[PDB]
Design a binder for this molecule. Structure first.
Ligand SMILES: Cc1cc(C(=O)Nc2ccn(C)n2)on1
Ligand SMILES: [Cl-]
Ligand SMILES: [Mg+2]
Ligand SMILES: [Mg+2]
Ligand SMILES: [Mg+2]
Ligand SMILES: [Mg+2]
Lengths: 194, 194
């Protein structure tokens, strides 16, 4: 029934643009919407990846590896899955493994890769693949992992046991000014609910 | 250590604005970021998203989701029921309200998250995730009445909780829909639990 009629550029930065979207509603009426897009998306199947990194070690409970960094749009520190945009010609899986190593120091093994999923679809066209990766924390490569932050990247690693993730996140929110990502929270909630 | 120095308005629409944020990086170097914000924030958060657990005796427990055309996406998306919080509305009340408007179901609040971020490298947008149970055996949830506001057009899709990820994957492959990242994250964790 519904579909896009036109997309008009309102304003274009280096990284983000705003568009006036005209679309057909299901009654047959023409309507508009204000849409955010990135300018960096080329032939990739999504803008980025987010990594669900399950750190596995003998005689340890599994941990979910998270990152904390200052996010200028939020004006503060956020706890998130490791994540980055996909380079031109790069696969989602390669992007995931690369960002996970850059942000955390860990070398993961691919487990699964989602289809492109939408970040905030009432506002933007932005999409990611969520890539689940296991980390063999008994491997010597993963013994004392050091982040390789890029230019302007400043990332702290937080590994939380999977079996208590929601409470551990809540404890972090209680003891500090910082925001948990909605995908991380959704993941922690389902772990409780299961 | 890092903080915001100033925010420059680039473009302001009715619903969304684009800003250039100046911030201090941890090395002491001043840097810029392009940031999106909504023009509607008042509240605890921009919006709510509802995790609606449909409980009917002798049936599988279902998660109730919604399918809508999303103009920024140019396509249809599957999401948790959700909307913006009305000025002077509590998150819990916004959750029950949106759930009724979008699905027709009348639910009970189980728990409510702190404000969590939507896409923190792009925007300041935040929501509360509100877990709600729905007694599907009550008369008020027999023939649920969806009350769409002006221009909203929503289809309701209930999927079994214990199979959610496989059911979503199927909807993507066969219906060319985009699943929301929070929904996908929830589904993954249901599989990853234990
Ligand atoms: C973001 C975002 C949300 C909307 C939206 O519903 N816009 C409407 C509805 C009625 N008018 C006059 N504009 O557009 N962009
Ligand atoms: Cl529940
Ligand atoms: Mg990153
Ligand atoms: Mg990165
Ligand atoms: Mg809605
Ligand atoms: Mg509504």
């Amino acid at each position: 029934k519904q579909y896009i009629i036109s997309e008009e550029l309102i304003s274009e930065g280096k990284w983000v643009k705003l568009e006036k979207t005209t679309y057909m509603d299901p009654t047959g009426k023409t309507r508009t919407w204000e849409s955010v897009k990135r300018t960096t998306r080329k032939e990739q199947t999504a803008d980025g990846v987010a990594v669900i990194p399950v750190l596995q070690r003998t005689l340890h409970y599994e941990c979910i590896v998270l990152v904390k960094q200052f996010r200028p749009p939020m004006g503060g520190y956020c706890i998130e899955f490791p994540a980055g945009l996909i380079d031109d010609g790069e696969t989602p899986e390669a992007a995931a493994l690369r960002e996970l190593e850059e942000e955390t120091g860990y070398k993961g093994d691919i487990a699964e890769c989602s289809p492109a999923v939408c970040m905030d679809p009432g506002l933007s066209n932005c999409t990611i693949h969520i890539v689940t990766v296991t980390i063999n924390g008994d491997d010597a490569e993963n013994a004392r992992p050091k982040p390789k932050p890029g230019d302007g990247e400043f990332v702290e690693v937080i590994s939380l046991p999977k079996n208590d993730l929601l409470q551990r996140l809540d404890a972090l929110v209680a003891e500090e000014h910082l925001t948990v990502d909605a995908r991380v929270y959704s993941y922690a909630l389902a772990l409780k609910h299961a």
